[PDB]
Amino acid sequence: PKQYPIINFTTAGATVQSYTNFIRAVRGRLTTGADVRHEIPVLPNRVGLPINQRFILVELSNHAELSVTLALDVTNAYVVGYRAGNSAYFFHPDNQEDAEAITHLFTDVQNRYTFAFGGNYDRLEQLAGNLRENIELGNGPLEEAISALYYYSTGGTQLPTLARSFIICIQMISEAARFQYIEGEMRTRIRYNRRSAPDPSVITLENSWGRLSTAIQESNQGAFASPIQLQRRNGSKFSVYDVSILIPIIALMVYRCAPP
Ligand SMILES: O=C(O)c1ccc(Cc2cccs2)cc1
């Protein structure tokens, strides 16, 4: 339709309800082409997906009324790049096909840049000089991340702050879309007007998203080949035998194959 779907969100006067509707809307657009036949939605297969269905845009704004737009890949719900003003910035794609795909984003803009680095946490934590466990999430942090992303395009933001801001945005949007549990953790932060880094329960879920997507889609009648290990709020390890307990926790999965 000329442009990809746009969801708007603002930190200005943000409430639990407004964040909830925002995440609801993002999931909606992510799952237009999803396989919703089983207990957990499966995002469209990367292979053969027409380019006009490949991305969604998330436009973020704050009290300062600065605006940036993130591009998310519908196949994994992950941020691939963003726009601020007349410039767009992309994470380093892993292959030639992904590199072609992003040429279809933000075609309007004068200035296009591809970072040397990918958008995985390991690398972003390195650039930020900060682990996820010491980077606070909440409305306040998201407000500041929006400003920092905007001012990267004017020379006002240094790369470590940019990376820290991506880590914030990805967790509060992509991971909240992927995980009802993480969305809920954000709702609590918004309710009580607090900012705090994610505990190990949030972090291991984020790290386990691909593995969980795999174990679930390769399960025998919903029971797992081998158990997957997660962490509680206090760091203690437990394991999960079957999908039952994960249906309320994971909202979307990356396409995975299945056995012979
Ligand atoms: O006991 C806890 O603190 C705890 C246990 C499990 C999780 C992850 C899940 C929450 C609901 C189902 S699995 C988080 C925190």
For the beta carbon of residue 187, count every other beta carbon within 10 angstroms. 17
Q: Do 208 and 144 share a structural domain?
A: no
Q: How far is CA 211 from CA 43, 171, 178, 253, in A?
A: 15, 18, 13, 10
| 184/199 Cα distance (integer angstroms) | 13
| 111/120 Cα distance (integer angstroms) | 24
From the list 4, 19, 121, 152, the catalytic residue is 121
Q: Do 126 and 38 share a structural domain?
A: yes
| 226/228 Cα distance (integer angstroms) | 7
Q: Is 75 in the pocket of ligand 1 (CB under 6 A)?
A: no
| 222/218 Cα distance (integer angstroms) | 8
Report the CATH number at residue 245: 4.10.470.10
Question: Which domain range does residue 241 map to?
Answer: 178-260
Q: Do 196 and 161 share a structural domain?
A: no
Q: Do 216 and 202 share a structural domain?
A: yes
256, 196, 205: which is closest to 231 by C-alpha? 205
Q: Does the annotation place 120 within a ligand binding site?
A: yes
The total number of structural domains in the chain stands at: 2
Residue 258 has φ and ψ, to the nearest 5°, of 110, 155
- Secondary structure, 3-state, the chain: CCCCCEEEEECCCCCHHHHHHHHHHHHHHHCCCCECCCCCCECCCCCCCCHHHCEEEEEEECCCCCEEEEEEECCCCEEEEEEECCEEEECCCCCHHHHHHHHHCCCCCCEEEECCCCCCHHHHHHHHCCCHHHCCECHHHHHHHHHHHHHHCCCCCCHHHHHHHHHHHHHHHHHHHHEHHHHHHHHHHHHCCCCECCCHHHHHHHHHHHHHHHHHHCCECCEEEEEEEEECCCCCEEEEEEHHHCCCCECCECCCCCCC
One-letter amino acid of 170: I
| 45/74 Cα distance (integer angstroms) | 9
**Cβ contact 258:240 at 8 Å:** no
Q: Do 147 and 238 share a structural domain?
A: no
Q: Is 76 in the pocket of ligand 1 (CB under 6 A)?
A: no
Residue where a domain terminates, one of 177, 206, 232: 177
Please tell me the experimental approach by which this structure was elucidated. X-ray
Per the annotation, the verdict on 78 as an active-site residue is yes
Which resolution in angstroms does this entry have?
2.4
Q: Do 130 and 198 share a structural domain?
A: no
Q: Does the annotation place 195 within a ligand binding site?
A: yes
- For ligand 1, what atom is nearest to the CA of residue 181? 10
Residue where a domain terminates, one of 146, 177, 208: 177
Q: Return the best residue to mutate from 40, 175, 181 for the ligand 1 pocket (most ligand atoms within 8 A of CB).
A: 181
Q: Do 40 and 29 share a structural domain?
A: yes
Q: Do 69 and 113 share a structural domain?
A: yes
CA max distance for the chain: 55
Report the CATH number at residue 153: 3.40.420.10
From the list 54, 83, 164, 178, the catalytic residue is 178
Q: Do 172 and 205 share a structural domain?
A: no
Per the annotation, the verdict on 178 as an active-site residue is yes
Enter the tokens of residue 181: 């549990």
Cα of 249 vs centre of ligand 1, distance in Å, is: 9
Q: Do 188 and 248 share a structural domain?
A: yes
Residue 108 has φ and ψ, to the nearest 5°, of -45, -35
Cα of 246 vs centre of ligand 1, distance in Å, is: 10
Q: Do 227 and 198 share a structural domain?
A: yes
Cα of 52 vs centre of ligand 1, distance in Å, is: 38
Q: Which residues contact 155 (CB under 8 A, 6 or more apart)?
A: none
Q: Do 172 and 53 share a structural domain?
A: yes
43, 119, 124: which is closest to 76 by C-alpha? 43
Residue where a domain terminates, one of 125, 147, 177: 177
Q: Is 232 in the pocket of ligand 1 (CB under 6 A)?
A: yes
